[PDB]
């Protein structure tokens, strides 16, 4: 009875770590993921800057 | 007895499925943020060589 | 009059050749901002669309 | 006599502001190298950081 009951407390104990640590992991890789994105959405926004420059002095 | 058993079995059930769930959207990011490695490694070796051209035609 | 003659044909000959060396640097040049242009559109729509898959599993 | 000095000046004064033209056209398209040069160096310093931290978090 007893050591039914410890046993299942540990696997419950396993699990539940396993998916906080999954969790953690998740929240990490999601935030470098956003990093990405602003970092697109600068880049983008130059080059686009830089090549209408570029046209103006080719017009020109 | 029987009662306390199936819940227990429920309860197992919810973080295997949970973990389960949090091992694929971790994967997913990860496999993004591979790709993300390989476009970065490709942009850079790009952006490096026109460099180069462009200091070659500076220089002469 | 024949000195003044030739120094003058000397004069056209100078103002000539550079007139050409300027007009062959300012080629070049300027073919190296084209090869520019058609490089930095090629990577806005690339990292254009990696911004969108990279958002495409932001939201999944 | 007279009009041949004078078609003459023309001439030199006809090369003379296409040189200067082409001179200033130089100048720039020069300039305008330098500053992709700027932006480029700019460019790589910053997806090689990024990517840095990016294989950070692969890596942990
Ligand atoms: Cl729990
Ligand atoms: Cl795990
Ligand atoms: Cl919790
Ligand atoms: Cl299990
Ligand atoms: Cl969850
Ligand atoms: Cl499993
Ligand atoms: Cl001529
Ligand atoms: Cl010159
Ligand atoms: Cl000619
Ligand atoms: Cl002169
Ligand atoms: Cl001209
Ligand atoms: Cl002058």
Same mark, same amino acid.
């Given at each position: &009875?007893?050591?039914?009951?410890? &046993? ?10 396993? &998916?906080?640590?999954?969790?953690? &992991?998740? #929240?990490?890789?999601?935030? #470098?993921?956003?990093? @990405?994105?602003? @970092?697109? @959405? ?5 080059? #686009?800057? @830089? ?10």
């Amino acid at each position: &009875r007893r050591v039914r009951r410890e &046993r299942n407390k540990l696997a419950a104990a396993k699990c539940r770590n396993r &998916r906080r640590e999954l969790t953690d &992991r998740l #929240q990490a890789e999601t935030d #470098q993921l956003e990093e @990405e994105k602003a @970092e697109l @959405e600068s880049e983008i926004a130059e080059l #686009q800057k @830089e090549k209408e420059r570029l046209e103006f002095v080719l017009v020109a």
